[PDB]
Design a protein around this ligand. Structure first.
Ligand code: NA
Length: 71
């Protein structure tokens, strides 16, 4: 899915760091997944604007699951 940031591993959503409409830059933390016994910031792969937030706190996600859509 183009413009979609997806989960790199299974985990639990701890918090979302951005809001719809936010400008983001490559490497910027978009949300935090608990996995591999740690808290992991999931980065933006590119500069952009946050278009949609596709998960909520507490949600269990799988590898490749859409997390954030960029505009
Ligand atoms: Na799930």
């Amino acid at each position: 899915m183009e413009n979609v940031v997806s989960a790199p591993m299974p985990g639990k959503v701890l918090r979302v760091l951005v809001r719809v409409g936010d400008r983001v830059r490559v490497g910027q933390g978009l949300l935090v997944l608990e996995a591999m016994k740690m808290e992991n910031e999931i980065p933006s792969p590119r500069d952009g604007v946050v278009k949609r937030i596709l998960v909520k706190e507490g949600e269990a996600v799988d590898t490749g699951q859409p997390l954030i859509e960029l505009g």
